[PDB]
Every structure is written in structure tokens, then in C-alpha cells.
């Protein structure tokens, strides 16, 4: 499982997970509108879309979105781009909105805090290396903090609404960099929002993500 | 040429070419404070992007952008990507400005109408498949009603900032799928934005490119 650490993404029918706290919870770096938008307008869409694309394809509803993911060559050719798309966007955004809180940032705790001093020399290195990745990202993606098939930590980037697990890497914890995500509040400033994101990054939970990976 | 018809597009320096009108002229379909973002902020970045990775390699500045993106393979691997993005990201914006005008829309006008009905049956038809194609391209990117190699007209869409010319196509005219060019007044809402834009479409313009075609 990916999307949650103990249940996989149902795909009989696929379902929009409501956040887990209110929309203004996030305002010390996302505006409530954006969190309405992008919850409620984006985050549906894939899910709509994906719940179309399974309908002309009933053999599929018995797997999870991560199996589909996982296999895309698997998936019929008429609908694998919507699957690929829709699907990712879907999975993608549902670790999003679990690892962001109303009380999260400050330094990391616990497992992950003496694995990224290991790996990447201290937080705050590792913190530009993400945002360094993040603003590198030409076009639409994303930019994950992933473990990769060897069992490493590392940080990469994907296209559109491309997911690492679709390599065999476990993303623990990843920002979103459409424009869509930060344009209402930061408009051309993608920097900015790099940087104000870390001060509401839910630890506890990217704790759970690192152990379950 | 691509940029201009009757100049190429210089890089000694490369320079962010005027709006042809005012930044609240095209208001039925694009807001004033997208036009400033878009043409200030976004495609000022290109132009200024571009220029540092020519200084790098001072050689290159006797081309220009045209001739830069047709053979991609004979600009230095170090920044090969970086001309490639910034490079076509100038050149597409700078058709993009030219194409719209504040006394613009309704039906297409002249050779362009003839080839139009010739080619896709109406406009009404081309304007179909045209928007379609532009809600088609995922993640960030353009449309393109494009002269391919073999003479015929064409509707394309490219990712993110790639240009038709990379591929032996002249670029008409082209509409611009990144999340900036509609978010602050259409948000998640593509297909609003491609529809309205026709409301202020430069036909006139559109006719010295496909005879320049
Ligand atoms: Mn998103
Ligand atoms: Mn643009």
C-alpha cells in the first residue's frame, strides 16, 4: 500500500478522501482558496476520471490503484494513459494531503531525522537539495523524497502526475509543483512557496511513511 | 524566420519584445493582471535565461533562436536543455502576442478561412478538434495549428515550452495550456479558457503566417 500505510487505493469505485482538517488550516503557506481548488476541483477530477475509465473495463475494479500503477503494460491500451494520468494524480494528491498539518513543520523527528543527517549530511542540506529539485522541475510534476529498489533515500522528480512506485520506489513524502498548487498566492514564485512548505510538513506521519517503506 | 515573419529571432542579446497593445486590451477573454504576469514575469524569465546560458558560449550568439531549436544536437550538451526550454519558451510566446488582438475574433477571414474548410470541413469543426486537443495535452504545454513537412495544415499540441519547429513544422498559431495563462481568472476550468479565447484571436496576423507558411 502506498497511498495509505495500512489499506491500498480502491479502485470499486475509486473515492475522494476528504481532508483531514479545515481548509484554512494550512494558511502560514497555503491559502484556504487553493486548498478549496485544489482538494476539491483537482483532486476530484482524477478521481472522476479514473472511475470512467474502469467502467468500460469491470476485469480492473477487483485491483488497487497502485497494482495498476505498478503494471501499466498490463492495463488496456485504450484507457492506460488515462489510468497512468488520473491514476497517479489520484495517489499522488492523497499522500499530499496526510502529510501536511495545522501544527506540522520545525525540524524532523525521530527514524527519518538521523537518516536524512546520514544521507544528506544534515536537515538543512537535505532541504535544499528537495528545493533545488523542486524549482529544476521544468513544466508540471512533482518532486519526492523517495526510498529507492536498493533501499536508499533519495530525492527525485517526476513529470505531470508520474509516481515513483511506477519504478519501484516508495515516496515518502513529496511536493507538489503545478502551478496550480502555489499561482493564486505565489503567482510566478515557485521558490517561495518551496520555502514556506516546509512549515506545515507533518513529521509524525512521514515517520509512519518512512517505516512502512 | 518563425518569431517575426520578416526578422528572426536574435540572441545578441535576446530581447523581450513589446505587448502590441495594452495589458487590459484583451479583457473579454484574458484578465489585465494575467497579460502583466505572463508577458513581465513569465516570458521575461525565458528571454533572461536564455541570455545567461549564451554568454556561456558566446559562439552561439551569432544564430538565432529559429536556428538554435531546428538542431538542438549541435548546441553544447551543457546547456542544450536550458536553450532548448528557454529558447522555445521565447519563441512561442513571442507568436503568442502577435496572434491576439483587442479587435479580434469571430470567424476566420481570407486564405487561412479557404484552408480551414478545405482541410477540417468548417470552422466550426477545426475549433472542436482544435479545443479538444488543447484539453488533451496534460501537465503543462501548447496547442498548435501548424504546416507540417508535407504542406498540409495541422493541429498539434506540444510539452511544456517545445516548439513545432524542433520537428520541421511551421507554427500558425498556438494556444498556451500552462496553468498561468488562465488561473487567476478560470482556475481549474481549461476548457473555459479555450473557449473563450477565440474572442480575441488575430485573424489578420494569422493570414501573413500561413502565406509566410
Ligand atoms: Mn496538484
Ligand atoms: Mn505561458
Known amino acids: 500500500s502506498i497511498g495509505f500505510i495500512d489499506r491500498q487505493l480502491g479502485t470499486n469505485p475509486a ?72 491514476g497517479g494524480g489520484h ?19 525521530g527514524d527519518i531525522a538521523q537518516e536524512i543527517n546520514q544521507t544528506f549530511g544534515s536537515f538543512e542540506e537535505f532541504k535544499k537539495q528537495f528545493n533545488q529539485a523542486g524549482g529544476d522541475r521544468f513544466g508540471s510534476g512533482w518532486v519526492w523524497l523517495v526510498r529507492n529498489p536498493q533501499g536508499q533515500l533519495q530525492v527525485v522528480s517526476t513529470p505531470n502526475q508520474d509516481n515513483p512506485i511506477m519504478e519501484g520506489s516508495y515516496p515518502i513524502m513529496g511536493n507538489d ?35 512502512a517503506s
Open 15 to 86: 473515492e475522494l478522501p476528504p481532508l483531514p482538517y479545515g481548509y484554512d488550516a494550512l494558511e502560514k503557506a497555503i491559502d484556504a482558496e487553493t486548498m478549496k481548488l485544489h482538494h476539491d476541483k483537482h483532486h476530484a477530477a482524477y478521481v472522476n476520471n479514473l472511475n470512467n475509465a474502469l467502467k468500460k473495463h469491470p476485469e480492473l475494479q477487483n485491483s488497487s490503484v497502485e497494482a495498476l500503477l505498478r503494471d501499466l503494460n498490463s492495463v488496456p491500451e485504450d484507457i492506460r494513459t488515462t489510468v497512468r494520468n488520473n
Open 177 to 211: 509543483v503545478w502551478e496550480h498548487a502555489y499561482y493564486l498566492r505565489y503567482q510566478n514564485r515557485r521558490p517561495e512557496y518551496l520555502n514556506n512548505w516546509w512549515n506545515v510538513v507533518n513529521w509524525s506521519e512521514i515517520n509512519r511513511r518512512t517505516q
Open 91 to 109: 495517489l499522488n494528491h492523497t499522500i499530499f494531503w496526510q502529510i501536511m498539518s495545522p501544527d506540522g513543520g520545525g525540524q524532523p523527528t
